[PDB]
Amino acid sequence: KDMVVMLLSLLEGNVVNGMIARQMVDMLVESSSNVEMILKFFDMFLKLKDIVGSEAFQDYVTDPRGLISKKDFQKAMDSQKQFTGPEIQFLLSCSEADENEMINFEEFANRFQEPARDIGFNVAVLLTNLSEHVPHDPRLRNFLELAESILEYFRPYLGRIEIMGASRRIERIYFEISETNRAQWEMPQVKESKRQFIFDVVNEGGEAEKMELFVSFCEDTIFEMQIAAQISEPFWGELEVQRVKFLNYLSRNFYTLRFLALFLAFAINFILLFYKVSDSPPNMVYYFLEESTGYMEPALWCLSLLHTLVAFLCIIGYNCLKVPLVIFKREKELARKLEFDGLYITEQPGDDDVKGQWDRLVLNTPSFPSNYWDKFVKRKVLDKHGDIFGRERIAELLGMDLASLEITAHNERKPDPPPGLLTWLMSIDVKYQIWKFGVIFTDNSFLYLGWYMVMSLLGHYNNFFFAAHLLDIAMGVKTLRTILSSVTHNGKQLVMTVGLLAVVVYLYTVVAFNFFRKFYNKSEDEDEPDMKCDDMMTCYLFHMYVGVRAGGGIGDEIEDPAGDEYELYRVVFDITFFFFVIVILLAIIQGLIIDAFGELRDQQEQVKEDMETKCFICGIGSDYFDTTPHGFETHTLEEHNLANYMFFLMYLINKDETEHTGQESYVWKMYQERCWDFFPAGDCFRKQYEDQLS
Amino acid sequence: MVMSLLGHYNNFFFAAHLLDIAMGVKTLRTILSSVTHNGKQLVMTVGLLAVVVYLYTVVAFNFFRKFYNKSEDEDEPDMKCDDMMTCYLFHMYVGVRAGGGIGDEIEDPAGDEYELYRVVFDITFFFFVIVILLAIIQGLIIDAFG
Amino acid sequence: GQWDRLVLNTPSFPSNYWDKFVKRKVLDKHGDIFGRERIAELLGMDLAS
Amino acid sequence: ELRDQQEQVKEDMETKCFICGIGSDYFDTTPHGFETHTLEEHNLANYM
Ligand SMILES: CCCCCCCC/C=C/CCCCCCCC(=O)O[C@@H](COC(=O)CCCCCCCCCCCCCCCCC)COP(=O)([O-])OCC[N+](C)(C)C
Ligand SMILES: CCCCCCCC/C=C/CCCCCCCC(=O)O[C@@H](COC(=O)CCCCCCCCCCCCCCCCC)COP(=O)([O-])OCC[N+](C)(C)C
Ligand SMILES: CCCCCCCC/C=C/CCCCCCCC(=O)O[C@@H](COC(=O)CCCCCCCCCCCCCCCCC)COP(=O)([O-])OCC[N+](C)(C)C
Ligand SMILES: CCCCCCCC/C=C/CCCCCCCC(=O)O[C@@H](COC(=O)CCCCCCCCCCCCCCCCC)COP(=O)([O-])OCC[N+](C)(C)C
Ligand SMILES: Nc1ncnc2c1ncn2[C@@H]1O[C@H](COP(=O)(O)OP(=O)(O)OP(=O)(O)O)[C@@H](O)[C@H]1O
Ligand SMILES: Nc1ncnc2c1ncn2[C@@H]1O[C@H](COP(=O)(O)OP(=O)(O)OP(=O)(O)O)[C@@H](O)[C@H]1O
Ligand SMILES: Cn1c(=O)c2c(ncn2C)n(C)c1=O
Ligand SMILES: [Ca+2]
Ligand SMILES: [Zn+2]
Ligand SMILES: [Zn+2]
């Protein structure tokens, strides 16, 4: 592996048909027999690993202990028609058959899988690197064909990205994707987050912020993977292990509890349909269930208590699953503004940003970067702004002990962490907790869950309050949320047109009070008239209440204008109120909703169209890549796959800095400097070497 | 075929066959496709309509029951909101189909302590159910044509 | 998928499909890794025939 | 009709230069080429 790593280092910054790459191919050809032997070592045991697990092989295994004789092994392998004569004999020699010629094929298959994995992957990378940089060498395809199984095995783990290197050229980087990283990336919650992120940047995002948003998405996704790993499952100590297990259970099953609460709400409201009010006890009336089974009344009490418990568990499930991301994001953006902007050093927000003013409480807290990965943000800010703003003033702002900086760098102290609850009392950063709770209390999702719980408790005072919970279907079902989004999309316009409706009706009221009052007698009685327009407030209410809701406008409600001096004036008043209010203004309200359906629909189409016509990374259209058959499909899955950039960032974090290659160090340095110039923009490997590749 | 055989038991079953024009004529099938294109959304908004009407029923049963006497008779009242199931049916049956919402059907709220509360109940039910929710149903069909 | 298991061993499985030698091709492709006798049992094939 | 007019105006400004009329696709050969072109090379404010 170390020799191959040296060979891969010689290929750093190597152009297509480079002299070093062609020399390396000649070196492999000069030692072709040895290379074939090495490749024949890897595929034989990779094939052996899957053969022993095959159903046909198990038919030969007859020993109850799980062993197999050499003669039985001999007839098992040649029945697969995958190995030759000498190959089977070599496998027999490698098998540690006992004095009874019995072979433990379980350990035999797994004996070399782990020791030879690192070298096998690097050989696959070496052949892949040479093939893509010397594509017109007939001598190299022979090695690729002989290593087809090795390449196929490591295909899901061989990640490749393209970057703009320091040499002002597009370079292709090959790295390793671990099994855990790919498994976590394929989780449905992570995939849903990716779809939401893609929709946001394509719809309401810019080109200059596209890569910075993408990196921020990667940082959030990595943090969420840690949370999922922590909550996953395979006297103080006894309770703590059960407490975290209980909390993890709620975090894992947060959405099922949300569904369960919605189900219980319908069950409670179904029972409430049987309520009946009667003067007689089961001049005040009594409200009681009316059913013959006799089990619904106890069931309502049981469901009401159960619903309250589930709602309470949702809050605990939420603050252990979603709150850490909220704190992580807020700490992340605050730290960068402290360093790269000097938010509380230079600009000092002008009291109109409640978010900025609230974050002042956490600057001097000893545990400010609790969720954010960078634990040395204060150290970095001090080195950047200390000279221009004052080291002692920066330390006071960030709550840093300057005298403690050196002693920590000198040696390390190991104190006594007493596992007592009393010692745990004063170890709580009260100021940080106040800041953290303020962030949680300003979260829309947490406030909704809090309202759901409060309503559940009010349900115990009157059960009818459990009706409010049936609203949850607004966000419980995504189909309704999309439908309701068609109402809230133009919500501001809907409010204004209703306000405009109130003003136009007031103008009609003023005309009526002044000129048409006699026609507003709404009493069939003859000696006591119920005049509806003897007061402006009463007449305005009359127009807004019965006038708007009437099919034919105000004219339907008011007395006939026939045989009267003002008949023509009243026909204009009635027809104009019908047109302007009933016809035009109600069409605007309906028109806004209909237009919202079209506007939301094209946003989905626009996002889908952009993803299938342009690359998310380089921005080059699919038309250019389609010169080569299936060019755009291969480009978005192999060359500029956005998932590989996610994996490459995780690869750099786990890998030791001393082991970073020249290309890896270049990208890693720019990640720490927040410079996204390594992302290819408007260029790709295929475009840079069009003459050589074609 | 089954409906044709049932037609022999009662000839009126032969009416079902007139539905065939849905696929017999391609023009109608395209028109009907504009309804089934957003059929799932149409079902959900009707379900949403049932939930919003239930919330109005709960408010009525609790606070506005006196106004639900639908009997011109004076000694035997036909109270429509003395039971939740009856009151919910009343809102779903006459309330939704009324042009001006529930207010048109129920007794006038004038000269009463809860008059302002009842005007908000009547105007909001007109806006949310008659105006907004029926526009969504019509909006889904219109959007499907586009 | 579960309903199609009834037709795998039927003597006239490719009645309408033009390829009448699908069973022969499947046996040659998966017989070595899954067992020729087990494939024949699954597809209702007589190896001696 | 009014909605697409706003979209058309916004789309044209973000896809073509107001001065030379060359599309953003040509300038995007260079990373952030169109952004620099509309802020440094052919900025309409500089002509003012
Ligand atoms: C008010 C609803 C808030 C949310 C509105 C959305 C829901 C739409 C409609 C829902 C239906 C509501 C049920 C109404 C029927 C209840 C009748 C009743 O019990 O009326 C209650 C009135 O009491 C109350 O008002 C208590 C409620 C406190 C304040 C109510 C406001 C809710 C606060 C909301 C919390 C956060 C809200 C902020 C977010 C805004 C909304 C998102 C009287 O009893 P009762 O004595 O004779 O018996 C009790 C039996 N014993 C007395 C014998 C024990
Ligand atoms: C005379 C013809 C003018 C009517 C033109 C209508 C054009 C729009 C005008 C609207 C306001 C009309 C006020 C007229 C000013 C005074 C007229 C006069 O000389 O007044 C005339 C009476 O003529 C009339 O009856 C005019 C009747 C007007 C009815 C027109 C119906 C149109 C309603 C339009 C509602 C506006 C809402 C628009 C919303 C826009 C949404 C898109 C004689 O008085 P007077 O000695 O008995 O003592 C006034 C009475 N007070 C003692 C109370 C002061
Ligand atoms: C039920 C319709 C099924 C399809 C609905 C879509 C059509 C929309 C409406 C169509 C109009 C239907 C005509 C109703 C009037 C019939 C009155 C009548 O005869 O009512 C019948 C009721 O009997 C029945 O119900 C028999 C029918 C069996 C079950 C009916 C359900 C139909 C089964 C559907 C088969 C597959 C359906 C699955 C797909 C779902 C739909 C796509 C009674 O007689 P009658 O005794 O006095 O005389 C007979 C004269 N002698 C008795 C003297 C002989
Ligand atoms: C008091 C003002 C609160 C009204 C604010 C309305 C805002 C939304 C609230 C809706 C539910 C109202 C319940 C109020 C809680 C109890 C109030 C109270 O203290 O109750 C007050 C009475 O005040 C009232 O009359 C309030 C009347 C509310 C009418 C508001 C009409 C709006 C209808 C909205 C329908 C919701 C559907 C929304 C769908 C959304 C679709 C987009 C005194 O009791 P109580 O001693 O006689 O014994 C309670 C009676 N029981 C014995 C039966 C328990
Ligand atoms: N750089 C890119 N990386 C990945 N996909 C890209 C890129 N540029 C454009 N795309 C397009 O994004 C589309 C979305 O990816 P795709 O649908 O294959 O993802 P998935 O992981 O299989 O799951 P899902 O269907 O949920 O998105 C692809 O069809 C591809 O054409
Ligand atoms: N010649 C040009 N000069 C300026 N902007 C141009 C030119 N051609 C195209 N544009 C586009 O016009 C858009 C509008 O400019 P921009 O939004 O940056 O202006 P502003 O002064 O910051 O304020 P505002 O957001 O109110 O327009 C830019 O995003 C740019 O892409
Ligand atoms: C989690 N994480 C990052 O997400 C990260 C990083 N350096 C840069 N980034 C983006 N480090 C060191 C890190 O631990
Ligand atoms: Ca090194
Ligand atoms: Zn690309
Ligand atoms: Zn220009």
From Swiss-Prot, chain A:
What happens to this protein after translation, modification-wise?
Answer: The N-terminus is blocked.
Motif segment (Selectivity filter): 551-557
- Domain of life according to the entry: Eukaryota
Provide the free-text tissue specificity comment from this protein's UniProt record.
Answer: Detected in skeletal muscle (at protein level). Fast- or slow-twitch skeletal muscle.
Residue stretches spanning the membrane: 254-274, 298-318, 437-459, 461-477, 493-513, 577-597
Q: Where Ca(2+) is bound, by residue?
A: T658
Tell me which parts of the chain lie in the Lumenal compartment.
460, 514-536, 557-576
| Domain EF-hand positions | 55-83
Residues the record lists as binding ATP? 191-195, 611-616, 636-642
Q: Which residues lie within the membrane without crossing it?
A: 537-556
The residue spans the entry assigns to the Cytoplasmic side of the membrane are as follows 319-436, 478-492, 598-694
Q: Which family does it belong to?
A: Belongs to the ryanodine receptor (TC 1.A.3.1) family. RYR1 subfamily.
Something else known: Binding of [3H]ryanodine indicates that the heterozygous channel is activated by Ca(2+) concentrations 4-fold lower than normal. Single-cell analysis of cotransfected cells shows a significantly increased resting cytoplasmic Ca(2+) level and a significantly reduced luminal Ca(2+) level.
What does the domain comment read? The calcium release channel activity resides in the C-terminal region while the remaining part of the protein constitutes the 'foot' structure spanning the junctional gap between the sarcoplasmic reticulum (SR) and the T-tubule. Pore opening is mediated via the cytoplasmic calcium-binding domains that mediate a small rotation of the channel-forming transmembrane regions that then leads to channel opening.
What task does this protein carry out? Cytosolic calcium-activated calcium channel that mediates the release of Ca(2+) from the sarcoplasmic reticulum into the cytosol and thereby plays a key role in triggering muscle contraction following depolarization of T-tubules. Repeated very high-level exercise increases the open probability of the channel and leads to Ca(2+) leaking into the cytoplasm. Can also mediate the release of Ca(2+) from intracellular stores in neurons, and may thereby promote prolonged Ca(2+) signaling in the brain. Required for normal embryonic development of muscle fibers and skeletal muscle.
Task: Report the protein name in the record.
Answer: Ryanodine receptor 1
Swiss-Prot record, chain C:
- Misc. remarks from the entry: Binding of [3H]ryanodine indicates that the heterozygous channel is activated by Ca(2+) concentrations 4-fold lower than normal. Single-cell analysis of cotransfected cells shows a significantly increased resting cytoplasmic Ca(2+) level and a significantly reduced luminal Ca(2+) level.
**Which family does the similarity line name?**
Belongs to the ryanodine receptor (TC 1.A.3.1) family. RYR1 subfamily.
Q: How does it assemble?
A: Homotetramer. Can also form heterotetramers with RYR2. Identified in a complex composed of RYR1, PDE4D, PKA, FKBP1A and protein phosphatase 1 (PP1). Repeated very high-level exercise decreases interaction with PDE4D and protein phosphatase 1 (PP1). Interacts with CALM; CALM with bound calcium inhibits the RYR1 channel activity. Interacts with S100A1. Interacts with FKBP1A; this stabilizes the closed conformation of the channel. Interacts with CACNA1S; interaction with CACNA1S is important for activation of the RYR1 channel. Interacts with CACNB1.
For this entry, the protein name equals Ryanodine receptor 1
Q: What is known of its domains?
A: The calcium release channel activity resides in the C-terminal region while the remaining part of the protein constitutes the 'foot' structure spanning the junctional gap between the sarcoplasmic reticulum (SR) and the T-tubule. Pore opening is mediated via the cytoplasmic calcium-binding domains that mediate a small rotation of the channel-forming transmembrane regions that then leads to channel opening.
Q: Which cysteines are joined by disulfide bonds?
A: none
Q: Provide the tissue specificity.
A: Detected in skeletal muscle (at protein level). Fast- or slow-twitch skeletal muscle.
> What is known about its processing and modification?
The N-terminus is blocked.
Residues engaged in binding caffeine:
W18
Give the subcellular location.
Answer: Sarcoplasmic reticulum membrane
Swiss-Prot record, chain D:
Summarize tissue expression: Detected in skeletal muscle (at protein level). Fast- or slow-twitch skeletal muscle.
Description of post-translational modifications: The N-terminus is blocked. Channel activity is modulated by phosphorylation.
> Where found in the cell?
Sarcoplasmic reticulum membrane
Binding residues annotated for ATP, in chain numbering:
M13, E14, T15, K16, C17, F18, T38, L39, E40, E41, H42, N43, L44
Q: Which domain of life is it from?
A: Eukaryota
Question: What more does the record tell us?
Answer: Binding of [3H]ryanodine indicates that the heterozygous channel is activated by Ca(2+) concentrations 4-fold lower than normal. Single-cell analysis of cotransfected cells shows a significantly increased resting cytoplasmic Ca(2+) level and a significantly reduced luminal Ca(2+) level.
Instruction: Name the family the entry cites.
Output: Belongs to the ryanodine receptor (TC 1.A.3.1) family. RYR1 subfamily.
State the oligomer form and interacting partners: Homotetramer. Can also form heterotetramers with RYR2. Identified in a complex composed of RYR1, PDE4D, PKA, FKBP1A and protein phosphatase 1 (PP1). Repeated very high-level exercise decreases interaction with PDE4D and protein phosphatase 1 (PP1). Interacts with CALM; CALM with bound calcium inhibits the RYR1 channel activity. Interacts with S100A1. Interacts with FKBP1A; this stabilizes the closed conformation of the channel. Interacts with CACNA1S; interaction with CACNA1S is important for activation of the RYR1 channel. Interacts with CACNB1.
Domain note for this entry? The calcium release channel activity resides in the C-terminal region while the remaining part of the protein constitutes the 'foot' structure spanning the junctional gap between the sarcoplasmic reticulum (SR) and the T-tubule. Pore opening is mediated via the cytoplasmic calcium-binding domains that mediate a small rotation of the channel-forming transmembrane regions that then leads to channel opening.
- The protein, known as: Ryanodine receptor 1
Tell me what organism the protein belongs to. Oryctolagus cuniculus
> Whole protein: which stretch is covered?
4942 to 4989 of 5037
